[PDB]
């Protein structure tokens, strides 16, 4: 139903708008494209984390992120999860 | 912001992933935000290069080909 395989367009869009100048605009098609990229990003990492042992946990995801070339994300993410649970 | 329930659904599209820890979607919500941010900023480079203020799908296709970290998206948004 699209609501079953993608993040909500407006939420994706809000993140993109924050990334570009205030004067910038984003085409509907580009919002939809990022929508697709983000789903692939989740699935890509998840698939790797799935083959980390043998429950997929936060540590599995963090390692997969390191394995697959997203090492820059690890520390920010650990700091985030820390604030999150505190 | 981003909805955890929906992140979980995406993770659960894969047949092999059956059990997910509660933290895992939280991590993805933030990671997806960081990823959207860097993809968008890299796409914007090409937006400006074509003298536009509107970011388009081809800008994302271009930025994907310029960064080895985005190699996994080549099938998703072909230049």
């Amino acid at each position: 139903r699209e609501q079953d395989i993608y993040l909500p367009i407006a939420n994706v869009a809000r993140i993109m708008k924050n990334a570009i100048p205030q004067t910038g605009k984003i085409a509907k098609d580009a919002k939809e494209c990022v929508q697709e990229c983000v789903s692939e990003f989740i699935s890509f990492i998840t698939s790797e984390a799935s083959e980390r042992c043998h429950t997929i946990n936060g540590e599995d995801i963090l390692f997969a992120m390191s394995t697959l070339g997203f090492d820059s994300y690890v520390e920010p993410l650990k700091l985030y999860l820390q604030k999150f649970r505190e | 912001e981003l909805p955890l329930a929906r992140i979980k659904k995406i993770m659960k599209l894969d047949e092999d992933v059956k059990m997910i820890s509660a933290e895992a979607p939280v991590l993805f919500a933030k990671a997806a935000q960081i990823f959207i941010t860097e993809l968008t900023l890299r796409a914007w480079i090409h937006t400006e290069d074509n003298k536009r203020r509107t970011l388009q799908r081809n800008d994302i296709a271009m930025a994907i080909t310029k960064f080895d970290q985005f190699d996994f998206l080549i099938d998703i948004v072909p230049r």
């Binding site: 699935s43 890509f44 698939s47 070339g69 | 599209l13 894969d14 996994f72 080549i74 099938d75």
Partner: peptide, 29 residues
């Protein structure tokens, strides 16, 4: 192509083919 991602890219091609071969995602959209 990125030596870190190569194997996992191949796997995800096959996973996407399967979901397609079902009806859980479309060919294009």
């Amino acid at each position: 192509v990125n030596a870190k991602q190569y194997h996992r890219i191949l796997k995800r091609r096959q996973a996407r083919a399967k979901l397609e071969a079902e009806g859980k995602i479309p060919k294009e959209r």
